[PDB]
Amino acid sequence: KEYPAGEPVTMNEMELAAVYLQPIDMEPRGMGLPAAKADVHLEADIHAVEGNKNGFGAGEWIPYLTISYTLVNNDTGEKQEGTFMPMVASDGPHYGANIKMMGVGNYKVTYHIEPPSKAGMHRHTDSETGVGRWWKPFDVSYEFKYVGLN
Amino acid sequence: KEYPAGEPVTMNEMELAAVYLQPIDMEPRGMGLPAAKADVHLEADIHAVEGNKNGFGAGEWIPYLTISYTLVNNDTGEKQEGTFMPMVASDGPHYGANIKMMGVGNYKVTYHIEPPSKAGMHRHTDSETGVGRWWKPFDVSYEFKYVGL
Ligand SMILES: [Cu+2]
Numbered sequence: 278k279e280y281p282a283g284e285p286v287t288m289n290e291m292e293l294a295a296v297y298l299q300p301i302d303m304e305p306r307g308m309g310l311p312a313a314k315a316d317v318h319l320e321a322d323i324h325a326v327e328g329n330k331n332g333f334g335a336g337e338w339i340p341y342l343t344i345s346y347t348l349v350n351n352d353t354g355e356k357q358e359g360t361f362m363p364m365v366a367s368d369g370p371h372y373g374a375n376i377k378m379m380g381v382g383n384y385k386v387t388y389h390i391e392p393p394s395k396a397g398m399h400r401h402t403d404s405e406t407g408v409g410r411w412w413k414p415f416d417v418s419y420e421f422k423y424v425g426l427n
Numbered sequence: 428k429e430y431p432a433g434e435p436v437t438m439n440e441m442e443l444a445a446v447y448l449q450p451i452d453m454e455p456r457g458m459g460l461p462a463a464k465a466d467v468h469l470e471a472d473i474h475a476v477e478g479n480k481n482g483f484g485a486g487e488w489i490p491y492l493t494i495s496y497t498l499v500n501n502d503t504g505e506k507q508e509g510t511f512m513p514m515v516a517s518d519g520p521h522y523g524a525n526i527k528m529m530g531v532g533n534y535k536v537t538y539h540i541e542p543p544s545k546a547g548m549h550r551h552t553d554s555e556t557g558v559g560r561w562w563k564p565f566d567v568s569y570e571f572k573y574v575g576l
């Protein structure tokens with residue numbers, strides 16, 4: 278049971294979507310909220326589309342991103358902020374975190390995305406094997422209605 | 428991927444090959460060997476194969492690995508230790524480094540490989556979407572004859 282958070286959007290030759298699930302157990306455990314103390318596992322789903330200039334083929338996961346989120350309950354104004362961790366689940370690698378939500382309501386979440394160069398991935402720059410410069414850091418936002426999972 | 432280094436190995440539901448090519452330029456050339464001071468760019472080409480239990484589909488690049496190498500010129504006995512960086516080129520992501528070789532001859536290179544957990548990748552362990560435990564760190568070796576480029 279996976280829940281869409283807003284609509285996927287394409288920016289910088291990547292398709293970027295936000296989704297959530299019931300809370301997960303992660304290894305290493307003890308980092309972040311345990312499933313029992315969270316309402317959802319929120320993810321950033323990010324893959325190359327056709328035309329990617331940074332060396333990724335269409336559909337490939339984009340690794341080494343640094344992603345922060347700012348989550349606002351629009352009904353109350355209460356917010357929370359954090360960073361996602363890279364992880365892998367049975368249908369592949371993604372970025373995510375367990376999240377305790379802030380009640381039923383209309384939410385907005387914004388993901389601030391930093392390119393792979395900022396977490397240790399290097400690019401070939403020669404004419405023979407090289408790729409283009411990385412895109413500049415950017416934001417994407419999603420609006421969704423949270424009603425709980427049960 | 429220009430010059431194959433030995434034969435690919437399939438282990439831990441990954442195919443692992445070594446290749447080298449001419450020295451390349453890297454952004455921003457940080458802690459690494461400049462192309463003008465190197466003989467080759469040596470790479471680890473590592474992708475999941477079918478039955479991978481760690482969440483990767485067939486042919487997918489394995490990200491977040493930590494890889495070091497031990498390179499031995501078997502003819503002279505001279506040894507070199509170093510590490511690879513994650514790297515993207517026109518044909519996709521890989522791990523590699525510019526390397527100064529130790530003369531022409533028969534070589535062995537061993538890659539020492541640590542799983543994505545060491546570089547900060549977490550795993551779902553839940554029943555519905557969880558994956559198996561990571562494999563333990565391991566070595567893969569390649570024998571090749573280096574004659575220059
Ligand atoms: Cu997740």
Ligand SMILES: [Cu+2]
Nearest residue numbers: 514522523524
């Ligand atoms: Cu490289």
